[PDB]
């Protein structure tokens, strides 16, 4: 079925691979070569997870867990039942994510729009790759990656963090959290603003962008503007994931001690390290 205004946009072209071969839709869904690649990688990955579930002796969804090879295998292959499945599923996951992005590129070309969506999504992919590929390779074993399970991946979060004490002390993690909280702040305000203009007090006419700018200047003395808030939302979000990836890439590699102790470089700066008083003297 089509949205009432959709037919004019469903023309041939924009594909990156295959010419017109996969240039078609299935209901609402655009296919393309990458829609086919995505299905392949996703189906295979799901099969391997099912298979992993039989060898684990449970079909319970919140018990299933696919673990990476143990540290002793380093960065080499591992028997299926002992981490090789995890290795293959990871190749499949990566294949699917990348394929999804490329399928986004083909939709962009057909529609004549900018490539910002796929670009932004690539930041999420990079975060994923940082945890299952870059950090593990740099550290020397696949075992440092997180396991594929609903609750077990959370155990890995706590166990990894606590290996360095209170993870709140990683300076890159602080910045990342700041972008996350700031992002939610900006999203709520943005949503609220536009809606407050489109849905004014009962019986009044729709407000205008000028009322939006005015509301914000009245309140805090500044309005970033309609274009600017969209650029900001984009930046905040991407920055949060960039700093997240960074906070983890440097943990276990350039820094492997307790994160609280890293802050001593500041306390023991020559010009104040020995002055009595305060908390650190």
């Amino acid at each position: 079925a089509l949205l009432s205004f959709e037919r004019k946009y469903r023309v041939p072209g924009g594909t990156l691979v295959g010419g017109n071969l996969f240039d078609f839709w299935v209901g609402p869904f655009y296919v393309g070569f990458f829609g086919v690649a995505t299905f392949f990688f996703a189906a295979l990955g799901i099969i391997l997870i099912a298979w992993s579930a039989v060898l684990q002796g449970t079909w319970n969804p919140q018990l299933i867990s696919v673990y990476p090879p143990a540290l002793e295998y380093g960065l080499g292959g591992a028997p299926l039942a002992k981490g090789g499945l995890w290795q293959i599923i990871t190749i499949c996951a990566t294949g699917a994510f990348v394929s999804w992005a490329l399928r986004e590129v083909e939709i962009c070309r057909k529609l004549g729009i900018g490539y910002h969506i796929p670009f932004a999504f690539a930041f999420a992919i990079l975060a994923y790759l940082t945890l299952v590929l870059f950090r593990p390779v740099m550290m020397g074993a696949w075992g440092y990656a997180f396991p594929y399970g609903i609750w077990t991946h959370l155990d890995w979060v706590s166990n990894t963090g606590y290996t360095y004490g209170n993870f709140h002390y990683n300076p890159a993690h602080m910045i990342a959290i700041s972008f996350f909280f700031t992002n939610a702040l900006a999203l709520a305000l943005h949503g609220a603003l536009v809606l407050s203009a489109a849905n004014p007090e009962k019986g009044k006419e729709m407000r205008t962008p000028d009322h939006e700018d005015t509301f914000f200047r009245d309140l805090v003395g500044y309005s970033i503007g309609t274009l600017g808030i969209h650029r900001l939302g984009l930046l905040l979000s991407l920055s949060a994931v960039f700093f997240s990836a960074l906070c983890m890439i440097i943990t276990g590699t350039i820094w492997f001690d307790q994160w609280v102790d890293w802050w001593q470089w500041w306390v023991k700066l020559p010009w104040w390290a020995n002055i009595p008083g305060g908390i650190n003297g």
Binding site: A1, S4, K8, L111, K204, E205, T208, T214
Partner: protein, 240 residues
């Protein structure tokens, strides 16, 4: 206990919220249609919301959605297959016809207004006090198309008054007439304005405006559609 009651309640609230949200997002484009324009059999499990009405500013009327919908323009395309789901090929010139990535919507043929009731966008020459405050001033630069040929020169900047931003470059062609180019589709360089979406012979085809000091929503859509359309349709003439 109390925590279990709270979480269970929360999941019920969430399901109602998603239901409300999805229905609010069906206010345009529905009901779904078959490729021939008739109502599709299967509309999905969510019903169309009760209509709501927006009172438009400056005596422009009302808008009630969902409402009866139509393209309100001819669509020059034809089927390429006997079954649903394949592409529809342009029957003439897609740029001219306004289809595909060259598509435009039949918006009102009135200019967008600011909060005071004046035209939101105006040529800089008619906007008292407005000047280029930073960056390279494009006014006076030659405009180059993707074929690397010069198609004209910049004679003005159309600015959004309320938002204080440059929205279009007004370019003059060989014949002395002008055309608007969206600021988002040009690259301002030190000795020229570069336009990747169109080759030099396609500039004349850019839709023209009625009044020389104002642009309607309908014209912005035609102009912006046509320019974006060149990324696909002027491709043969693009160099590298």
């Amino acid at each position: 206990d109390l925590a279990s009651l709270a979480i269970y309640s929360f999941w019920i609230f969430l399901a109602g919220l998603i239901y409300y949200l999805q229905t609010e997002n069906m206010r345009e484009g529905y009901p779904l249609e078959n490729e021939d324009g008739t109502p599709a059999a299967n509309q999905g499990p969510f019903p169309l919301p009760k209509p709501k009405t927006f009172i438009l500013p400056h005596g422009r009327g009302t808008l009630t959605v969902p409402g009866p919908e139509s393209e309100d323009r001819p669509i020059a395309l034809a089927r390429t297959a006997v079954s649903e789901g394949f592409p529809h090929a342009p029957t003439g010139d897609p740029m001219k016809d306004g289809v595909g990535p060259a598509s435009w919507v039949a918006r009102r043929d009135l200019p967008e207004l600011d909060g005071h009731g004046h035209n939101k966008i105006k040529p800089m020459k008619a906007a008292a006090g407005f000047h280029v405050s930073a960056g390279k001033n494009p006014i006076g630069l030659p405009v180059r198309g993707c074929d690397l040929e010069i198609a004209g020169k910049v004679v003005d900047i159309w600015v959004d008054i309320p938002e204080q931003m440059a929205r279009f470059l007004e370019v003059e062609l060989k014949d002395g007439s002008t055309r608007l180019l969206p600021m988002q589709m040009v690259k301002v360089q030190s000795n020229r304005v570069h336009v990747n979406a169109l080759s030099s012979d396609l500039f004349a085809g850019i839709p023209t405006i009625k009044s020389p000091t104002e642009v309607t929503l309908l014209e912005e859509d035609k102009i912006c559609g046509y320019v974006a359309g060149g990324l696909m349709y002027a491709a043969p003439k693009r160099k590298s």
